[PDB]
Amino acid sequence: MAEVEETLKRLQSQKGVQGIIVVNTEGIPIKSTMDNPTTTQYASLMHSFILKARSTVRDIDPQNDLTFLRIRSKKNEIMVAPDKDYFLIVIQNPTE
Amino acid sequence: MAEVEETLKRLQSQKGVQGIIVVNTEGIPIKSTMDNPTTTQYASLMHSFILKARSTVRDIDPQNDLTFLRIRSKKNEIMVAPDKDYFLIVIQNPTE
Amino acid sequence: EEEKQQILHSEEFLSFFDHSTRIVERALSLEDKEGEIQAGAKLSLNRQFFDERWSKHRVVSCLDWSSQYPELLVASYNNNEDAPHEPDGVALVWNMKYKKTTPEYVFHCQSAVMSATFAKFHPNLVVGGTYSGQIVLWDNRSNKRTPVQRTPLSAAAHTHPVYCVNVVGTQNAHNLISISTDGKICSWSLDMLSHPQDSMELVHKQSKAVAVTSMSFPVGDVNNFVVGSEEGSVYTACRHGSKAGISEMFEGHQGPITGIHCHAAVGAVDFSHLFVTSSFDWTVKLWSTKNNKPLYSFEDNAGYVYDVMWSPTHPALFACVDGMGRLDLWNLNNDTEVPTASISVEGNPALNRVRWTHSGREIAVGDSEGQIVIYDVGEQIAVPRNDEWARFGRTLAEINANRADAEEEAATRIPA
Amino acid sequence: LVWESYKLDPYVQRLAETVFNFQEKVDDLLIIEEKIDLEVRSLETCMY
């Protein structure tokens, strides 16, 4: 718990980070640091993107690196890291 | 004139670049010099994932401009971006 | 491709691709089991393909790696000695990567097939010839193990048993060369196989033609090849031209040409003059285009050497095999007298042909009993540096000077 | 015929033509007989 939380706080220790959220497909985040309605809504949105990306991967190659898939867009480098038990979605910056 | 071919050579011969497709906005790769079906399937998968990313963005805020989607997979972790005008493919490994 | 180009050649699409490519480029810019490089990567006899329906009572005839895809082995079998009812002779294949012992196309041949090789000019098929006067083509596309088409076994084609054949010309313009025991130089049209595209009754030394038992051509020099002889008169076979044929009767042995390939190692020093040869008289010598006599030799084993076809990268290594059942890979830059990589097969059985892979990554070996054994040939000896290629060429020149010096010493030191 | 015959080349050509025709007919008949035997076995083993 505290190990994963410290790892998240270290990866998001970069200044200006939009938000690093340990997430879930259930529409709520495992560990987020944003506004609660926005965090739950973005958790559901990332759940939808995660299901679509999982189907896309299984269509392309069903044995790929299916534990993380970032979105390094200019707005937020959305580092989705869906684990096997939990999940993560880190809307991060393009710098660090 | 040679800018498109230069971009294809840049994003296809980068640091571990999988290959570059100057594809149209339909998603599927344009220049496929082998069995095109794998390129079209992977590009349709990536277009579905990009639409999912757009849906998540609009869930957060639809007026966000995107640079790329940093897809991470064992076949070709694509840092590409399917667009409404074309599709520029850049699949490379940041650690390689 | 017009729509693909127009999607590519849009100005906005080209600019977006350039910006995204530059941005992405700037953003993204056991060991002990691996410790057998100099002690096993050059010789790792692994793939023991022996189809008992074919391997038993049969020997190995020749071998090659397919240019279209080197993952397979395009090799034939010799005359099945104890199969009066069963097929006379066919070709097996063991995939290098995939673990499938069955050949993808067991082209069973009615006669006894002489030798064969794959062909990437029309990569759907394989080609070969018979030990009774036929050359046939079979394809992995078809579903018949018999010959898809046969060259006309008449005066036009190789009447005598033609043991060597090669598809002269790449996919640009292919004309399957055939050389007969009766010396019928026959560049055959790979598409129209009714009659060969060329019918040249090759001969040398005042039309007293020799038995061309080992055909070889320089890499890319489609206008000149090299033909071995049973009488040893290996005369440089010009391939293109009116007077094309075996001209310079360089004699660098004392027996029939066992197996000879053009020593076409590639690097800084272009050794296209040299050509590795093997004799029936246990005389593995290095004949060359300039060196009318054998430049340097090797006569270690008592029995006759099987064949010689060095790898196409390092001029130092002379890939061959001993008649007493052992490999023979002598690296010239490593040693000049003793055979360097004289690996020994199990049971010391003889072979009649062997070949490195088309990439040089593995040097397989045949068997008299038919057990096809493939030995990996890694980068310990096959990786030629440009300096190492130049070093081997300079060592060859120094050895030529030393041979001239030793000949002079013998000439001035013979007590007469 | 005989080896001393002046039409030895045409006789060899005719023998070759007959051999090739017989081989082609044998191969085609083998394929067709495999198809027919498969059809008969399927009819015998089919559902009602």
XYZ file of C-alpha atoms in Angstrom:
656
model
C 0.000 0.000 0.000
C 2.421 2.660 1.224
C 5.053 1.291 -1.160
C 2.739 1.734 -4.149
C 1.588 5.110 -2.805
C 5.182 6.286 -2.395
C 5.991 5.020 -5.893
C 3.044 6.996 -7.255
C 4.067 10.114 -5.315
C 7.622 9.764 -6.629
C 6.535 9.324 -10.253
C 4.216 12.322 -9.794
C 6.806 14.285 -7.802
C 7.506 16.090 -11.092
C 6.171 19.632 -10.824
C 3.199 20.585 -12.967
C 1.909 17.013 -13.258
C -1.753 17.008 -14.283
C -2.554 13.940 -12.209
C -1.201 10.451 -11.580
C -4.046 8.118 -10.663
C -3.967 4.479 -9.757
C -7.228 3.532 -11.385
C -9.818 0.833 -12.026
C -12.287 -0.252 -14.686
C -15.060 0.325 -12.114
C -15.193 4.077 -12.724
C -13.290 4.952 -9.547
C -9.515 5.307 -9.062
C -7.374 3.171 -6.796
C -5.319 6.237 -5.827
C -5.932 9.616 -7.484
C -4.923 13.175 -6.591
C -7.501 15.343 -8.381
C -11.060 16.584 -7.855
C -13.270 13.694 -6.758
C -16.068 14.032 -9.358
C -13.483 14.726 -12.054
C -11.364 11.823 -10.786
C -14.270 9.360 -10.887
C -15.420 10.624 -14.294
C -11.914 10.350 -15.736
C -11.622 6.912 -14.123
C -14.747 5.814 -15.989
C -13.445 7.443 -19.181
C -10.115 5.650 -18.786
C -12.054 2.446 -18.111
C -13.803 2.870 -21.465
C -10.518 3.666 -23.209
C -8.939 0.682 -21.436
C -11.615 -1.735 -22.622
C -11.333 -0.350 -26.161
C -7.532 -0.603 -26.059
C -7.728 -4.163 -24.703
C -10.073 -5.156 -27.525
C -7.821 -3.333 -30.008
C -4.765 -5.202 -28.714
C -6.545 -8.567 -28.777
C -7.533 -7.751 -32.361
C -3.921 -6.895 -33.219
C -1.929 -9.210 -30.930
C -3.564 -10.845 -27.883
C -0.243 -11.352 -26.010
C 1.293 -7.863 -26.009
C 2.394 -5.565 -23.163
C -1.160 -5.412 -21.818
C -0.309 -3.784 -18.504
C 0.307 -0.179 -19.552
C -0.382 2.046 -22.536
C 0.260 5.754 -22.130
C -1.317 8.607 -24.078
C 1.490 11.139 -24.548
C -0.781 13.815 -25.956
C 0.127 17.481 -25.651
C -2.610 18.105 -23.072
C -1.784 15.335 -20.589
C 0.678 12.477 -21.030
C -2.031 10.101 -19.843
C 0.034 7.140 -18.638
C -2.554 4.409 -18.322
C -1.027 1.455 -16.461
C -3.802 -1.106 -15.999
C -2.400 -3.750 -13.675
C -3.761 -7.279 -13.345
C -5.487 -6.660 -9.998
C -5.569 -2.861 -9.751
C -5.025 -0.327 -12.544
C -3.310 3.011 -13.046
C -3.964 6.035 -15.232
C -1.411 8.810 -14.848
C -2.375 11.992 -16.687
C 1.196 13.279 -16.681
C 3.296 15.947 -18.400
C 5.418 15.617 -21.556
C 8.624 16.610 -19.717
C 9.602 14.151 -16.979
C 7.698 17.223 -52.058
C 10.159 14.845 -50.401
C 8.917 15.859 -46.933
C 6.465 12.941 -46.728
C 9.123 10.387 -47.689
C 11.595 12.054 -45.315
C 9.037 11.818 -42.498
C 8.417 8.159 -43.343
C 12.166 7.507 -43.220
C 12.443 9.451 -39.950
C 9.613 7.676 -38.119
C 10.496 4.305 -39.699
C 14.268 4.461 -39.096
C 14.250 6.200 -35.693
C 15.552 4.671 -32.453
C 14.008 1.227 -32.831
C 11.190 2.519 -35.033
C 8.781 -0.188 -36.159
C 7.805 1.603 -39.377
C 6.038 4.759 -40.533
C 2.796 4.939 -42.515
C 1.622 8.240 -44.010
C -1.920 6.934 -43.799
C -5.177 8.684 -44.615
C -7.747 9.682 -42.001
C -9.538 6.332 -42.472
C -7.027 4.796 -40.034
C -5.733 1.907 -42.156
C -2.132 2.340 -43.384
C -1.608 3.828 -46.829
C 1.847 2.593 -47.880
C 2.003 -1.134 -47.074
C 4.704 -2.856 -49.158
C 3.886 -6.359 -47.837
C 0.734 -8.164 -46.750
C -1.323 -5.030 -45.984
C -3.899 -6.839 -43.795
C -1.753 -6.722 -40.646
C -1.185 -2.983 -41.108
C -4.893 -2.344 -41.707
C -5.937 -4.450 -38.693
C -3.426 -2.826 -36.332
C -4.312 0.628 -37.660
C -8.047 0.028 -37.221
C -7.282 -1.115 -33.673
C -5.269 2.072 -33.093
C -8.040 4.212 -34.621
C -10.561 2.626 -32.255
C -8.173 3.315 -29.373
C -7.718 6.912 -30.572
C -11.486 7.392 -30.714
C -11.621 5.989 -27.173
C -8.959 8.517 -26.166
C -11.027 11.275 -27.786
C -14.076 10.043 -25.851
C -12.118 10.123 -22.589
C -10.832 13.599 -23.480
C -14.358 14.855 -24.161
C -15.353 13.310 -20.831
C -12.660 15.500 -19.277
C -12.739 18.436 -21.727
C -13.326 18.080 -25.492
C -11.255 21.178 -26.367
C -7.910 19.450 -25.683
C -5.373 19.170 -28.512
C -3.474 15.882 -28.696
C 0.103 15.259 -29.796
C 0.188 11.448 -29.857
C -1.127 8.345 -28.114
C 1.783 6.498 -26.486
C 0.438 2.981 -26.937
C 2.627 0.363 -25.254
C 2.529 -3.177 -26.638
C 4.961 -6.008 -27.312
C 4.429 -5.945 -31.088
C 5.038 -2.244 -31.778
C 4.484 0.289 -29.001
C 3.008 3.012 -31.191
C 3.482 6.675 -30.309
C 1.133 7.529 -33.171
C -1.936 9.747 -33.650
C -4.864 8.999 -35.989
C -6.253 12.326 -37.166
C -9.246 13.681 -39.072
C -7.010 14.808 -41.967
C -4.524 11.922 -42.216
C -2.719 9.376 -40.038
C 1.018 9.639 -39.333
C 2.387 6.425 -37.821
C 5.364 6.536 -35.460
C 5.872 3.254 -33.590
C 9.139 3.277 -31.631
C 10.566 2.180 -28.283
C 11.595 5.126 -26.047
C 14.096 2.991 -24.117
C 15.460 1.621 -27.405
C -0.872 2.909 -54.638
C -2.221 6.169 -56.075
C -4.570 6.749 -53.127
C -1.782 5.835 -50.696
C 0.550 8.331 -52.370
C -2.109 11.068 -52.419
C -2.715 10.512 -48.708
C 1.062 10.709 -48.279
C 1.654 13.533 -50.795
C -0.879 15.912 -49.260
C 0.914 19.047 -48.079
C -0.887 19.134 -44.720
C -0.359 15.386 -44.269
C 3.329 15.696 -45.180
C 3.850 18.589 -42.748
C 2.021 16.765 -39.941
C 4.052 13.613 -40.609
C 7.301 15.605 -40.551
C 6.435 17.334 -37.267
C 5.222 14.135 -35.582
C 8.234 12.145 -36.817
C 10.736 14.751 -35.605
C 8.961 15.093 -32.242
C 8.767 11.326 -31.728
C 12.399 10.875 -32.793
C 13.581 13.570 -30.375
C 11.464 12.023 -27.608
C 12.388 8.364 -28.147
C 16.037 8.649 -29.189
C 22.199 -18.273 -19.860
C 25.544 -16.503 -20.213
C 27.445 -19.776 -19.720
C 25.129 -21.344 -22.301
C 26.025 -18.303 -24.425
C 29.715 -18.827 -23.591
C 30.324 -21.181 -26.524
C 31.202 -18.580 -29.169
C 34.790 -19.582 -29.973
C 34.098 -23.085 -28.592
C 30.867 -24.203 -30.216
C 29.064 -21.406 -32.055
C 31.169 -22.070 -35.155
C 30.235 -25.780 -34.923
C 26.973 -26.689 -33.154
C 25.626 -29.838 -34.831
C 21.966 -29.594 -33.837
C 19.328 -30.373 -36.477
C 19.438 -34.124 -37.116
C 16.725 -34.452 -39.751
C 16.442 -38.057 -40.933
C 13.062 -39.138 -42.306
C 13.210 -42.923 -41.918
C 10.817 -43.252 -44.856
C 13.593 -41.578 -46.874
C 16.807 -41.396 -44.826
C 17.331 -45.143 -44.403
C 19.202 -46.884 -47.244
C 19.839 -43.482 -48.840
C 22.694 -40.975 -48.947
C 22.925 -37.179 -49.231
C 23.438 -35.704 -52.703
C 23.657 -31.914 -52.267
C 22.170 -29.104 -50.196
C 21.288 -25.422 -50.268
C 19.463 -22.730 -48.331
C 16.597 -20.995 -50.116
C 17.317 -17.402 -51.130
C 13.652 -16.400 -50.888
C 13.580 -17.633 -47.276
C 16.691 -19.138 -45.645
C 14.575 -20.634 -42.835
C 14.428 -23.950 -44.740
C 16.871 -26.395 -46.317
C 16.455 -27.170 -50.025
C 18.394 -30.435 -50.278
C 17.964 -33.722 -52.124
C 18.640 -37.362 -51.397
C 20.884 -39.745 -53.299
C 19.868 -43.050 -54.858
C 17.817 -45.045 -52.367
C 19.924 -48.194 -52.278
C 17.366 -50.620 -50.825
C 14.014 -49.311 -52.139
C 13.235 -51.391 -55.243
C 9.506 -50.891 -54.697
C 9.571 -47.498 -52.960
C 10.397 -44.114 -54.526
C 13.715 -43.802 -56.330
C 14.708 -40.438 -54.873
C 13.112 -37.346 -53.342
C 13.991 -34.145 -51.521
C 13.515 -33.455 -47.823
C 13.514 -30.194 -45.913
C 13.942 -29.326 -42.237
C 12.991 -25.775 -41.320
C 15.689 -23.977 -39.362
C 13.272 -22.070 -37.135
C 10.114 -24.183 -37.156
C 10.483 -27.667 -35.666
C 8.844 -29.713 -38.421
C 10.731 -32.788 -39.601
C 8.451 -33.356 -42.589
C 9.438 -31.563 -45.808
C 6.920 -29.004 -46.970
C 7.096 -30.522 -50.467
C 8.495 -34.055 -50.817
C 8.971 -33.935 -54.580
C 9.361 -37.642 -55.245
C 11.134 -38.237 -58.555
C 10.682 -41.214 -60.856
C 14.361 -41.433 -61.777
C 17.240 -40.956 -59.343
C 17.525 -37.208 -58.765
C 21.039 -35.888 -59.266
C 21.058 -32.576 -57.400
C 18.779 -29.666 -56.693
C 18.534 -26.130 -55.360
C 15.824 -23.631 -54.495
C 15.178 -20.534 -56.614
C 14.022 -17.093 -55.467
C 13.475 -15.745 -59.001
C 10.157 -17.634 -59.053
C 10.055 -18.515 -55.355
C 7.040 -20.843 -55.517
C 9.007 -23.787 -56.940
C 12.160 -25.878 -56.652
C 14.347 -27.210 -59.443
C 16.715 -30.106 -59.918
C 18.038 -32.846 -62.144
C 18.274 -36.608 -62.348
C 21.031 -39.216 -62.448
C 19.619 -40.652 -65.679
C 19.122 -37.659 -67.965
C 16.261 -35.511 -66.717
C 15.781 -32.142 -65.055
C 12.421 -31.486 -63.403
C 10.686 -28.656 -61.568
C 8.325 -29.052 -58.613
C 6.407 -26.410 -56.688
C 5.127 -26.164 -53.127
C 1.945 -24.696 -54.622
C 0.859 -27.944 -56.301
C -0.429 -31.029 -54.481
C 1.385 -33.711 -56.515
C 4.644 -35.134 -55.209
C 5.600 -36.117 -58.764
C 7.391 -33.710 -61.102
C 5.274 -30.760 -62.189
C 7.174 -30.585 -65.468
C 10.195 -32.341 -66.933
C 12.903 -31.220 -69.306
C 12.768 -33.290 -72.501
C 15.081 -36.270 -71.989
C 16.381 -36.035 -75.549
C 19.444 -34.791 -77.415
C 18.455 -31.219 -76.560
C 18.894 -31.682 -72.821
C 21.574 -33.236 -70.621
C 21.571 -36.806 -71.902
C 24.240 -38.095 -69.522
C 23.710 -37.868 -65.764
C 23.991 -34.140 -65.031
C 24.944 -33.769 -61.376
C 25.055 -29.950 -61.263
C 22.465 -27.291 -62.062
C 21.773 -23.698 -61.053
C 19.204 -21.079 -62.006
C 21.469 -18.576 -63.741
C 20.049 -15.083 -63.435
C 18.001 -13.571 -60.613
C 14.356 -12.487 -60.745
C 15.456 -9.786 -63.210
C 16.204 -12.319 -65.965
C 16.485 -15.989 -64.984
C 17.765 -18.746 -67.290
C 18.417 -21.996 -65.428
C 21.966 -23.069 -66.218
C 22.608 -26.778 -66.625
C 25.984 -28.462 -67.034
C 26.066 -32.115 -68.019
C 28.431 -34.994 -67.582
C 28.388 -34.771 -71.367
C 29.246 -31.093 -70.954
C 25.907 -29.758 -72.186
C 26.012 -26.187 -70.914
C 22.265 -25.490 -70.824
C 20.843 -22.193 -69.586
C 17.196 -23.248 -69.491
C 14.245 -20.868 -69.526
C 12.726 -21.162 -66.048
C 9.247 -20.465 -67.440
C 9.209 -22.278 -70.807
C 10.774 -25.623 -69.908
C 10.038 -27.446 -73.172
C 13.554 -26.750 -74.438
C 16.379 -24.957 -72.629
C 16.864 -21.300 -73.481
C 20.505 -22.115 -74.275
C 22.007 -25.314 -75.697
C 25.806 -25.063 -75.641
C 27.894 -28.207 -76.153
C 30.736 -26.975 -73.977
C 34.252 -28.286 -74.598
C 37.838 -27.304 -73.846
C 41.429 -28.220 -74.749
C 40.861 -28.571 -78.497
C 37.238 -29.749 -78.132
C 38.222 -32.690 -75.902
C 35.502 -31.828 -73.405
C 35.917 -32.751 -69.755
C 33.449 -34.119 -67.225
C 32.131 -31.012 -65.482
C 31.511 -32.562 -62.077
C 31.444 -29.311 -60.084
C 29.861 -26.135 -61.435
C 30.503 -22.828 -59.687
C 30.071 -19.192 -60.637
C 31.332 -15.942 -59.120
C 28.778 -13.961 -57.133
C 27.121 -11.701 -59.701
C 29.558 -12.460 -62.541
C 26.891 -14.029 -64.732
C 29.251 -13.887 -67.729
C 31.823 -16.326 -66.331
C 31.587 -19.430 -64.154
C 33.981 -22.189 -63.085
C 33.727 -25.898 -63.898
C 35.597 -28.720 -62.183
C 36.775 -31.829 -64.005
C 37.096 -35.530 -63.412
C 40.379 -35.160 -65.303
C 41.165 -32.154 -63.096
C 41.342 -29.601 -65.934
C 39.272 -26.978 -64.132
C 39.140 -24.385 -66.917
C 37.478 -21.009 -66.320
C 34.033 -21.233 -67.908
C 33.008 -17.988 -69.530
C 29.225 -17.975 -69.302
C 28.114 -15.135 -71.585
C 29.404 -14.506 -75.088
C 29.932 -16.303 -78.369
C 33.150 -18.084 -77.352
C 31.851 -18.570 -73.804
C 33.223 -21.685 -72.174
C 36.044 -23.263 -70.213
C 39.169 -21.349 -71.254
C 42.062 -21.206 -68.778
C 42.832 -24.821 -67.927
C 44.234 -24.082 -64.476
C 45.422 -27.348 -62.919
C 45.519 -27.113 -59.140
C 45.117 -30.745 -58.070
C 45.884 -34.328 -59.107
C 42.406 -35.875 -59.055
C 38.754 -35.326 -59.929
C 37.190 -32.115 -58.651
C 35.507 -33.256 -55.439
C 33.517 -30.095 -54.730
C 34.468 -26.521 -55.630
C 32.832 -23.147 -55.074
C 33.976 -19.696 -56.095
C 35.783 -18.196 -53.091
C 33.544 -15.127 -53.169
C 34.196 -13.784 -49.668
C 33.130 -10.140 -49.433
C 34.874 -7.374 -47.514
C 37.607 -4.801 -48.045
C 39.852 -7.193 -50.001
C 37.945 -8.541 -53.010
C 39.236 -12.099 -53.482
C 37.193 -12.849 -56.611
C 40.298 -14.269 -58.297
C 40.548 -17.099 -55.750
C 38.210 -20.102 -55.829
C 38.164 -22.881 -53.233
C 38.465 -26.368 -54.709
C 38.535 -29.958 -53.462
C 40.101 -32.947 -55.206
C 39.552 -36.682 -55.324
C 43.249 -37.091 -54.417
C 42.868 -35.752 -50.841
C 44.252 -32.478 -52.223
C 42.355 -29.430 -50.954
C 44.072 -26.634 -52.869
C 43.355 -22.943 -53.422
C 43.197 -22.422 -57.162
C 42.716 -18.867 -58.382
C 41.940 -16.945 -61.550
C 45.430 -15.448 -61.723
C 47.187 -18.401 -60.075
C 47.192 -20.954 -62.882
C 48.822 -23.379 -60.484
C 47.327 -23.941 -57.023
C 48.250 -20.975 -54.847
C 48.134 -22.935 -51.592
C 47.040 -26.421 -50.626
C 45.996 -28.665 -47.754
C 46.422 -32.454 -47.741
C 45.757 -33.490 -44.143
C 43.302 -36.381 -44.419
C 44.302 -39.559 -46.222
C 40.839 -40.210 -47.633
C 39.330 -38.141 -50.405
C 37.738 -34.886 -49.274
C 34.027 -34.575 -49.976
C 33.463 -30.998 -51.147
C 34.690 -27.461 -50.545
C 32.480 -24.362 -50.423
C 33.812 -21.644 -48.142
C 31.508 -19.151 -46.482
C 30.899 -15.906 -48.415
C 32.190 -13.493 -45.728
C 35.589 -14.514 -44.315
C 38.194 -15.508 -46.936
C 40.153 -17.104 -44.082
C 37.727 -19.996 -43.558
C 37.727 -22.811 -46.127
C 34.581 -24.816 -45.426
C 35.045 -28.511 -46.212
C 34.726 -31.954 -44.628
C 36.982 -34.964 -44.192
C 36.250 -38.262 -45.903
C 36.893 -40.164 -42.668
C 33.902 -38.517 -40.977
C 34.962 -35.109 -39.686
C 34.354 -31.459 -40.493
C 37.071 -29.273 -42.026
C 37.018 -25.486 -41.519
C 40.536 -24.019 -41.654
C 40.747 -20.267 -41.022
C 43.634 -18.904 -43.095
C 44.190 -15.881 -40.854
C 44.297 -18.312 -37.905
C 46.460 -21.067 -39.421
C 47.739 -22.137 -42.826
C 48.854 -25.761 -42.358
C 46.575 -27.470 -39.817
C 42.784 -27.470 -40.306
C 41.439 -25.043 -37.723
C 37.873 -26.225 -37.020
C 38.206 -29.949 -37.684
C 35.036 -30.947 -35.860
C 34.280 -34.665 -35.721
C 30.849 -36.103 -36.414
C 29.450 -38.961 -34.369
C 30.500 -42.366 -35.668
C 32.921 -40.901 -38.270
C 30.577 -41.451 -41.236
C 31.469 -39.987 -44.604
C 29.484 -37.455 -46.632
C 29.454 -36.372 -50.278
C 28.329 -32.747 -49.884
C 27.962 -30.024 -47.261
C 27.025 -26.362 -47.328
C 26.987 -23.273 -45.170
C 23.666 -21.465 -44.969
C 22.807 -18.750 -47.480
C 23.483 -16.256 -44.687
C 26.526 -18.169 -43.448
C 24.939 -18.550 -40.014
C 25.096 -22.362 -40.087
C 27.208 -24.925 -41.937
C 25.287 -28.180 -42.241
C 26.740 -31.576 -43.127
C 25.385 -34.554 -45.035
C 25.854 -38.234 -44.316
C 26.493 -41.459 -46.192
C 23.715 -43.025 -44.116
C 21.459 -40.041 -44.838
C 21.424 -38.424 -41.398
C 21.271 -34.724 -42.277
C 23.104 -32.952 -39.431
C 23.093 -29.145 -39.308
C 25.900 -27.351 -37.475
C 25.502 -23.696 -36.562
C 28.392 -21.491 -37.692
C 28.292 -18.311 -35.627
C 30.379 -15.151 -35.637
C 33.501 -16.657 -34.042
C 34.912 -17.498 -37.479
C 32.310 -16.300 -40.013
C 32.088 -12.661 -38.897
C 34.528 -11.003 -41.315
C 35.628 -7.514 -40.400
C 36.631 -5.305 -43.310
C 40.092 -5.158 -41.766
C 39.850 -8.902 -41.128
C 38.846 -9.401 -44.760
C 41.692 -7.084 -45.755
C 43.999 -8.887 -43.312
C 43.077 -12.230 -44.879
C 43.687 -10.829 -48.363
C 47.068 -9.451 -47.321
C 47.891 -12.801 -45.712
C 46.947 -14.447 -49.006
C 49.298 -12.136 -50.909
C 52.056 -12.804 -48.371
C 51.425 -16.542 -48.692
C 51.703 -16.237 -52.474
C 55.023 -14.450 -52.010
C 56.115 -17.139 -49.540
C 55.125 -19.883 -51.991
C 57.169 -18.199 -54.717
C 60.054 -17.874 -52.247
C 59.801 -21.545 -51.261
C 59.675 -22.582 -54.923
C 62.802 -20.500 -55.549
C 64.475 -22.054 -52.489
C 63.674 -25.561 -53.736
C 64.879 -24.657 -57.238
C 68.206 -23.291 -55.983
C 68.622 -25.880 -53.191
C 67.969 -29.099 -55.143
C 71.259 -31.059 -55.258
C 71.782 -31.980 -58.911
C 10.883 -51.407 -84.169
C 14.647 -51.822 -83.715
C 17.736 -49.810 -82.808
C 18.915 -50.080 -86.421
C 15.720 -48.338 -87.578
C 16.144 -44.948 -89.230
C 13.183 -43.485 -87.292
C 14.676 -44.244 -83.872
C 14.310 -40.620 -82.792
C 10.604 -40.502 -83.760
C 10.020 -43.850 -82.053
C 11.648 -42.549 -78.875
C 9.522 -39.414 -79.176
C 6.345 -41.479 -79.529
C 7.298 -43.643 -76.552
C 7.931 -40.486 -74.534
C 4.564 -39.037 -75.549
C 2.801 -42.253 -74.553
C 4.640 -42.367 -71.220
C 3.796 -38.745 -70.412
C 0.140 -39.228 -71.360
C -0.108 -42.377 -69.250
C 1.479 -40.630 -66.268
C -0.872 -37.654 -66.528
C -3.881 -39.948 -66.881
C -2.751 -41.995 -63.882
C -2.369 -38.886 -61.722
C -5.735 -37.432 -62.735
C -7.471 -40.782 -62.241
C -5.880 -41.124 -58.804
C -7.234 -37.715 -57.793
C -10.686 -38.433 -59.239
C -10.848 -41.878 -57.621
C -9.909 -40.337 -54.283
C -12.780 -37.879 -54.731
C -15.238 -40.629 -55.707
C -14.202 -42.896 -52.825
C -14.549 -39.977 -50.414
C -18.038 -39.253 -51.754
C -19.108 -42.893 -51.434
C -17.766 -43.131 -47.884
C -19.545 -39.890 -46.973
C -22.837 -41.179 -48.375
C -22.449 -44.421 -46.429
C -21.548 -42.675 -43.171
C -23.853 -39.670 -43.484
C -26.786 -38.745 -41.278
C -30.339 -39.592 -42.342
